[PDB]
């Protein structure tokens, strides 16, 4: 029922920008909290950004404050992530997370910054 799929990835250089998307179905985004996670090659999975269920408060990780921006769309049911001022340490596979009954993890999209 609940399915997440990630899109909007690509290959960028140092100083570029990209806008990821996470299309959602089976749940409303106003009644659940979502998180964004990334998987660098050879590194563990770490939390990137999140929006609470009310949508008032957005949070970011300690390495990505001041540069990333997370946003949601209520009608299209798609969770976005605007990323700016990209460093080559952000070479990772990005996954969107939600806890609706069970945890649902998408297939992910490869984003390389080089």
């Amino acid at each position: 029922q609940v399915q997440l799929v990630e899109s909007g990835g690509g290959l960028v250089q140092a100083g570029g920008s990209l806008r990821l998307s996470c299309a959602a179905s089976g749940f409303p985004v106003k009644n659940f909290e979502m998180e964004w996670y990334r998987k660098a090659p050879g590194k563990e999975r770490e939390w990137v950004a999140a929006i609470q269920s009310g949508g008032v408060e957005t949070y970011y990780a300690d390495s990505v404050k001041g540069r990333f921006t997370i946003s949601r769309d209520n009608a299209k049911n798609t969770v976005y992530l605007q990323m700016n001022s990209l460093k080559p340490e952000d070479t990772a596979v990005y996954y969107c997370f939600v806890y609706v009954g069970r945890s649902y993890i998408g297939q992910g999209t490869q984003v390389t910054v080089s």
Binding site: E33, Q52, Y59
Partner: peptide, 10 residues
């Protein structure tokens, strides 16, 4: 668990 997380996240 980052210190910039919210109170539902922390």
């Amino acid at each position: 668990f980052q210190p910039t997380n919210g109170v539902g996240y922390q």
